[PDB]
Amino acid sequence: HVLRFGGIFEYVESGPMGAEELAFRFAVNTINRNRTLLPNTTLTYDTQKINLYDSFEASKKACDQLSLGVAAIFGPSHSSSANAVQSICNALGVPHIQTRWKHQVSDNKDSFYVSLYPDFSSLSRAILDLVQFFKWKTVTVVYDDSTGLIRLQELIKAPSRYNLRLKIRQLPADTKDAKPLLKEMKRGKEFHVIFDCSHEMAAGILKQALAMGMMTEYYHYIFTTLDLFALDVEPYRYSGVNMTGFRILNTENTQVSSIIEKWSMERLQAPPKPDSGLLDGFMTTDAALMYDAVHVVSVAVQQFPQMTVSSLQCNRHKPWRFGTRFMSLIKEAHWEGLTGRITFNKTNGLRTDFDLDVISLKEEGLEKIGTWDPASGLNMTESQKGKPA
Amino acid sequence: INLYDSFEASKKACDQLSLGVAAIFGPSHSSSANAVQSICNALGVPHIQTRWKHQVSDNKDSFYVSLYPDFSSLSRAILDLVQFFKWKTVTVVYDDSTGLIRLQELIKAPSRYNLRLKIRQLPADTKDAKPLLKEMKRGKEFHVIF
Amino acid sequence: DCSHEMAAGILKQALAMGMMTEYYHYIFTTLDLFALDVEPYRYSGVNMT
Ligand SMILES: *[C@@H]1O[C@H](CO)[C@@H](O[C@@H]2O[C@H](CO)[C@@H](O[C@H]3O[C@H](CO[C@H]4O[C@H](CO)[C@@H](O)[C@H](O)[C@@H]4O)[C@@H](O)[C@H](O[C@H]4O[C@H](CO)[C@@H](O)[C@H](O)[C@@H]4O)[C@@H]3O)[C@H](O)[C@H]2NC(C)=O)[C@H](O)[C@H]1NC(C)=O
Ligand SMILES: *[C@@H]1O[C@H](CO)[C@@H](O)[C@H](O)[C@H]1NC(C)=O
């Protein structure tokens, strides 16, 4: 048996394609081999290359894929294109997967989509638990673009409950012009910084702060990104700095590291950039989310054997006859992947339960110092250091 | 047009441009206006937006105008009013998260002056303002902006 | 008190050790201070003389 998926990827001109497409093709190859699941059915796909930051081209490619006939469209990363693809697949009833966080409209009435990216409400309360553990009074939150203010909503609302002083600054459009901003932060004399940006932006900010001579024993940085292992701590390890972040890729598991070395040769197929200050040979988190997304789609479609793909039409409003049952089978599968266990909130379809672990910069590198959970709060080995009778 | 349906707005815009018009005065909701703006920017037809929507910082569309006042200038006017009134502690109360996009200069203004900020969000329904007003009275501050 | 090559080496090691603050003041007895790279330390607020 055969089954086709819908892949939409915002491509880059020249070089290799995006790492999400590499993870998608590698994951399809590892489902087409290694017969743990899907014995009677093989999986094919169809990838399209759409324009960066456009939604009409995304709608055209989604209608081309739906006229071709797919099982589930794997949506893009940009917010407006994901909104358009969410609208068309909601109107046609085809299930949708998001590997990237988008701004959720509160009064939107859609139910034909899931997003395996962790919710920033739970991430924001994880940051709140970490800043409550460190006993801070004045903190400065630095973001890059305005939508991050949506992503740190509970951090903004948290001075209404505690005695936490909080200042907020925005990084400029030019990535190398942080020197006035870091000069102002050095003049203001704050030593408690929460950065909210991508890992490449965080690497550029950290390098320009090293050129600023900022980080010491006094300063302390908390990064909201989940790609802290992509950075190199070689020019920052011996300076006594307490960079702290969150992780979701449980590299302690052996099969996870097997996936790491299975993706390492395709990573080094693309040339690295040593000037960027990024450690090559490591998974970005969205590739792991795409891997776990198509794996949980695979274990959901394994339970449904009568999956027939119909070439639906955008110009008509005839929904798929299997879309409701397939979505109501997707929305509860407890597949164990590279991001820990995967569960979906049944109210909205957003991933709100996960097992992060907090990492910190030690003198030997980045080490795991604890574990965050939504129900269990924040248990860590440092708090359980002194436990006498 | 239906409530919050970007594909329906896309289909109506396609049918209307197949009928042929000069310019389109699009919807009042942000996602459908974004889809209609992208479609008419791809097809060259001008767009006129009445209500403010969130602008993506790196969208290269140039076939659209907006007639709501820009919320950066509104935030600067609000900050001018607050700095005229000589205040220290304020409570920003919003309902939709895009208001945090709208009043971003007011949140950045503690880096400028010695302004104390308390920011609260109204609940999902409309009749449950009373617990927020009870928390407002119990928090013992008076300068409230909505 | 060293050569300018050892001065560049000890300056890179001091940058890696977080010595490049406003507190630290450095005096070099070598006469080749323009031979050193002025770029990665001139924004750190150090006092090199
Ligand atoms: C599916 O999505 C739902 C989204 O609506 C999830 O509901 C949300 O659940 C979280 C986690 O339980 C809630 O988080 C926290 O807030 C409560 C306090 O709210 C209390 O005050 C509110 C006042 O308006 C009420 O609305 C609440 O119902 C309740 O009256 C805290 O008690 C929680 O605390 C954890 O954190 C604090 C420190 O901050 C500790 O004191 C606690 O002991 C514990 O350590 C949370 O902070 C959230 O309120 C809730 N609702 C939303 C977002 O609207 C739902 O859980 C989710 N389900 C699954 C399965 O994923
Ligand atoms: C920073 O790290 C040191 C050693 O790792 C630790 O003793 C200290 O408590 C940390 N925090 C601060 C604020 O210095």
Ligand SMILES: *[C@@H]1O[C@H](CO)[C@@H](O)[C@H](O)[C@H]1NC(C)=O
């Ligand atoms: C997590 O919490 C449990 C008890 O709640 C504790 O036994 C365990 O040691 C904690 N994990 C770590 C890494 O400290």
Ligand SMILES: *[C@@H]1O[C@H](CO)[C@@H](O)[C@H](O)[C@H]1NC(C)=O
């Ligand atoms: C460093 O030089 C500045 C002048 O630029 C001076 O104000 C400051 O006191 C000096 N600091 C030390 C530690 O010598």
